[PDB]
Design the sequence.
């Protein structure tokens, strides 16, 4: 159960970083 | 320790949905 929870934290972190990269990208589109 | 990991998954998810909503608002503007 621990390992699964640890793997879920790492998957969610990864998705959050991708979503933050997508927000920064669209903020640049707005600024253009 | 399990409870701390469960709290961390719940905080990451909550954050993920804030970022998804923000991505959708920006996509609509753009």
Sequence:
């Amino acid at each position: 159960r621990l390992k699964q929870l640890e793997x879920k934290v790492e998957x969610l972190l990864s998705k959050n970083y991708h979503l933050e990269n997508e927000v920064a990208r669209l903020k640049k589109l707005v600024g253009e």
Remarks:
- Helices of chain A lie at 2-31.
